[PDB]
Each structure stands twice: as structure tokens, then as C-alpha cells.
Amino acid sequence: GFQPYRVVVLSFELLNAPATVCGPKQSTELVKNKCVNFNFNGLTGTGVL
Amino acid sequence: DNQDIVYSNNTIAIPMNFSISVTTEVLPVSMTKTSVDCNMYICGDSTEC
């Protein structure tokens, strides 16, 4: 309880601003005029593009 | 508007001419019929919910 510890605190904001830090997700060629479950920087959902 | 009419016990009023009037009366009958889908309102493109 008296030995030194190194503390790192990370703070981020989600899904309300343009983003520059993402995880390891491989992209996919996009298609239009069909309803598909999409993913735009973590924004999921199904709809017609 | 006031009329201040008086009472006479031996005098009667009798009309001497007549007219024909046309009046309008509008009544509602029906209202719009609406169907509500339970899902696609509480849910939609979401099989988890």
C-alpha cells in the first residue's frame, strides 16, 4: 500500500463529433438503393443508402 | 338590446305579410380512420428489441 503506482486516465467522446481514433475494423465497398445493416464510424443500423 | 314592451289587455298584434327564409346548419358525421403498427414505432430494423 506504500509502493508507487503509475496511473493513466483516458477520456473520449462518442458518437457526437467527427472522429479520428478508431479500432481495427476492415472496411467494405458500399452499395446504394438497398437496405443493409451499415457501420459509419460506429453508427450501426439498417436502412437504404 | 332592450325592448321596454308594455302590456295591454285588449290589444293583439297580427302580422300582415310573410317571407321565406333559408338557413344553414352543418353537422360532422365521421372522422379519419387510423391503423397503428406496434413494432416499427416502439422498434424497427432492430431484432434485439
Ligand SMILES: *[C@@H]1O[C@H](CO)[C@@H](O)[C@H](O)[C@H]1NC(C)=O
Ligand atoms: C308583402 O311584401 C312583399 C315583398 O316586399 C310586397 O311586394 C307586398 O306588397 C307586401 N304585401 C302587403 C299586403 O303589404
